Ligand SMILES: CCCCCC(=O)N[C@H]1CCOC1=O
């Protein structure tokens with residue numbers, strides 16, 4: 001269990017409380033999307049996606065079970081699927097449950113030609129910067145990622161901490177929905 | 179989704195946040211009992227029990243699926259089972275999800291001879307006063323009750339509100355455990 005954030009204002013504390021309270025009442029994909037729309041409305045980004053995956057023994061996604069696009073450009077997602085970027089996207093290689101991953105930091109460390117190709121393409125599509133939160137359940141090797149694209153979220157330490165803490169509850173909701 | 183309480187102090191708000199955060203990480207009966215022990219340590223009672231039940235079409239328990247005794251006297255539970263009090267206990271007739279039920283108020287309204295007998299017996303065993311919180315999921319007609327015995331909890335409006343809000347999350351945890 002990841003620790004709750006220190007240094008939140010009463011307003012931020014209340015927002016987080018509302019978010020985790022709401023998340024625990026999510027039963028349907030409809031409710032899940034509606035809730036993510038609400039969370040999105042509080043972040044300095046316009047691009048959010050949640051995915052659920054079956055994991056390997058190192059807590060990496062080996063199979064995508066559900067992709068819930070909230071506000072990624074549909075053209076980018078279409079390209080991602082069509083061009084099989086799942087095989088080249090460094091974000092899908094994260095060890096889930098090991099802490100928030102900043103994309104620019106992860107991208108700068110990539111070495112493969114195909115990975116660099118993907119990064120260049122993501123960059124042209126306004127996806128060069130962002131953050132991915134994650135949670136995993138070894139009850140049945142299942143995990144979730146919450147991705148938010150942009151530079152501003154990562155610079156808001158409180159928001160990062162809030163979304164990070166929300167993530168395990170979104171994970172439980174996603175499992176219920178699936 | 180029941181509304182979060184108004185008028186909590188920052189400390190009470192933080193406690194509630196910790197409780198719902200912790201509840202969403204519960205995966206095992208062990209963890210569930212340990213967490214309920216923690217919650218118990220914050221209430222002016224020493225007697226707590228959680229139960230999960232399959233419901234009828236009016237959201238009343240028709241079958242008990244799991245009874246997790248945290249701190250009811252074992253002698254009282256033994257008697258309850260042995261004497262089949264489930265059939266006579268007004269608390270097991272609550273419509274789950276319809277708000278916290280104060281036992282003294284519910285008991286005062288009982289009319290049946292067997293119900294009155296049970297009430298008299300509960301009273302002698304220090305169970306004449308208390309409160310039961312509840313939540314229900316019509317996904318599969320399943321609900322939970324959280325019972326706390328004593329007079330002091332009901333007199334602490336903040337605690338009542340906090341435990342009430344925690345209940346749906348304990349319910350989801352109980353479903354995961356079962
Ligand atoms: C469609 C699944 C993609 C989930 C992983 C993710 O958010 N990947 C970022 C990295 C840059 O571009 C993306 O789409």
Ligand SMILES: CCCCCC(=O)N[C@H]1CCOC1=O
Pocket residue numbers: 227229245258267269270281300305306310325
């Ligand atoms: C063993 C299941 C009992 C759950 C319902 C409950 O908490 N009933 C109270 C009412 C007075 O005595 C009790 O045990």
